[PDB]
Amino acid sequence: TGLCDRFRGFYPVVIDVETAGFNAKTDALLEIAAITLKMDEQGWLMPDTTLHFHVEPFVGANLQPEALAFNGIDPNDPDRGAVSEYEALHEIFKVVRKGIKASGCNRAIMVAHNANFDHSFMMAAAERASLKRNPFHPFATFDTAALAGLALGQTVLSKACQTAGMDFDSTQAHSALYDTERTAVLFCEIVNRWKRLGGWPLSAAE
DNA sequence: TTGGCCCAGGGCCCC
Ligand SMILES: [Mg+2]
Ligand SMILES: [Mg+2]
């Protein structure tokens, strides 16, 4: 009933990014939050550690106005508190490598909504900053849109949360911290409901 | 417990 036995040794980490566009290679990463997970004694999954950073646009990054219109971020504001892609990701990777070790996992896997998006941005930022020993799987993800489709019959984040019996706020939507937390709680509830229904462990049904 | 965008009104929701 250990975390390391749940996902074949993958350590699931919830990620949401806010960006200045849809292209991971050309558009600025502006914000990232990460939430690691843990299992209790009863084997229920739940949020553990929470990290959140404002990110300084990389050298030569594009900034799409419509993106900034959508997320309401201003990369010029000297008050936002931005750090380098190197800084935010170094911190995230350190906390993650520590969680992998403590739980006896061997690799992290990104949990995110329409996960290829956040995965592509984090990987692009890691490559730019030349971070070595990136603990995240280089192509596998746990997409909560697909998981919600299965569990809840909904793929839109806000709707999936509401369908799962969670609160989800519009006026708080479109900020990394809130997004990541709701996503983490959605993922945990999906995993936990599968367990409550006797789908896990694989021996439980019989 | 989406308001606003994008291809008048409908449907979309990873920025
Ligand atoms: Mg968001
Ligand atoms: Mg997102």
Numbering used by the authors: 8 to 213
Give the published text:
RNase T is a member of the DnaQ-like 3′–5′ exonucleases with a DEDDh domain that contains four acidic DEDD residues (D23, E25, D125, and D186) for binding of two magnesium ions, and one histidine residue (H181) for functioning as the general base in the active site for the hydrolysis of the 3′-terminal phosphodiester bond of a nucleic acid chain. RNase T can digest both DNA and RNA and it has a unique specificity that its exonuclease activity is reduced by a single 3′-terminal C or completely abolished by a dinucleotide 3′-terminal CC in digesting either DNA or RNA, referred to as the C effect. To determine the molecular function of RNase T, we show here by biochemical and structural approaches that it is a structure-specific DNase capable of digesting intermediate structured DNA during DNA repair. RNase T has an ideal dimeric architecture for binding and processing the 3′ end of various structured DNA in diverse ways, including duplex, bulge/bubble, and Y-structured DNA.
